[PDB]
Amino acid sequence: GSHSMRYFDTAMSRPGRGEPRFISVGYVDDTQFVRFDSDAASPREEPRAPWIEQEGPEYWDRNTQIFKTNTQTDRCSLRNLRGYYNQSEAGSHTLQSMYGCDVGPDGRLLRGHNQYAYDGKDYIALNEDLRSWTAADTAAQITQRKWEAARVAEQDRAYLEGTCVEWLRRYLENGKDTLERADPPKTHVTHHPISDHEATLRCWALGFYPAEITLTWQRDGEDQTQDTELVETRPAGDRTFQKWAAVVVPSGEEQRYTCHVQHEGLPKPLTLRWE
């Protein structure tokens, strides 16, 4: 199927407690393959996926250099941003970044990404064209003018269309037994009386990968979107995910409800009922 590579970076200032922490985590789909934390005491011991170790030490060296330089760049960014919002030297602030590529089953580029958020608010994004910016406010317009003058989008484009696609295809090949394997959900329905009058039906999906899934209840073949409690998909810690969806049903009407499960590892979508 389709795949993504994405880096999620967080820089957090902490006045009076040293320089801002920088952490960068890289993923293929829902699998983390790299981490760099400026607060790690042993950079050499920082986790790397096995299909990464195979690339050898010069790959590690080149990635370590970029992460180290990125630490300093995100600290420069935080100093500038404090100024662009007239903020005091006393507060802690957060700069987040996501960058990477989406490819289709053929490994062709679907789109690239490079965007930022400051204190939880979208700040600037590279547009889908990989040539122009969208700035959220007059602060981000400063960044945009700076990046336009320096031709930064051309550098980001070259990474997204070249390096990112090329290395995602190499990781998918090296890690094909895991990264290209979808594990279907193990599914069942439980029944929890709430009173004489009603019960909860809960439809469970366990042990699936990747995390994307659709889990829904129908009453007499009508979607029950409003009446369904859907919990956030959650990691089990063994690479796989879990989810459930619950509806409250009148006593004796359980057989009118069907749970519907769509997932990439299923040869066909499931329909389930209580018992």
Partner: peptide
């Protein structure tokens, strides 16, 4: 593979 970043 990581990307060089640019100061905001």
């Amino acid at each position: 593979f990581a990307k060089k970043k640019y100061c905001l």
